[PDB]
Amino acid sequence: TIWQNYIDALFETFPQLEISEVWAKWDGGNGDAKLTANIRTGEHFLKAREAHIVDPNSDIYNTILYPKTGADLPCFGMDLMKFSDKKVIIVFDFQHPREKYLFSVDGLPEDDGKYRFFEMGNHFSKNIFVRYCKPDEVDQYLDTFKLYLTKYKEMIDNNKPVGEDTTVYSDFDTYMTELVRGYMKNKFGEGRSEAFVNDFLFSYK
């Protein structure tokens, strides 16, 4: 995968997040598409849920860390998406569970507001990070990603949250579910795509 350095950085920062379930291994596409879905658990987190899909023209790593509750911490989410042979979109952010709550982190870049990608202040922070690039270029943004990870580890470590109330994340998982799902439908079928979104991606609704 073109995302190996991101994945390595994520689990260097959070070595406690160990695979607790391999939720799915699926073939799809022409199968020439392979999907891996893992649930990871470990100190300070309810779960990290990691989706990784590859085919001849795509490489998608979609992962959200859901911290334990009661410290009002955000999730950390990323959608690292090679979607064609020559194109990638990279998105990562601190995604707060509370609707309409504006979050930010001192010392991180702030989006300039030139492009309207996501609803700022509603499960996306001032520091939303969105870039398009070539597959050949994806590590240009690795250093910035590592800085985000450093700030997230600091807030997790400072707070040591212990709550296990998954309903904290209901509004967030509903919102993300509502946010065509063309890729998944085309490759794995309408049924498996629906199960993937509801039972794995956003299962706290």
From Swiss-Prot:
GO terms for biological process, alphabetical: phytochromobilin biosynthetic process
Domain of life: Viruses
Enzyme class: oxidoreductase
Entry-linked Pfam families: Fe_bilin_red
MF-aspect GO terms: cobalt ion binding; oxidoreductase activity, acting on the CH-CH group of donors, iron-sulfur protein as acceptor
UniProt KW keywords: Oxidoreductase
UniProt signal peptide: none
Enzyme Commission numbers on file: 1.3.7.6
Chain's role: Plays a role in phycoerythrobilin biosynthesis, the red pigment chromophore photosynthetically active biliproteins of the host cyanobacteria. Uses a four-electron reduction to carry out the reactions catalyzed by two enzymes (EC 1.3.7.2 and EC 1.3.7.3) in host.
Name this protein carries in UniProt: Phycoerythrobilin synthase
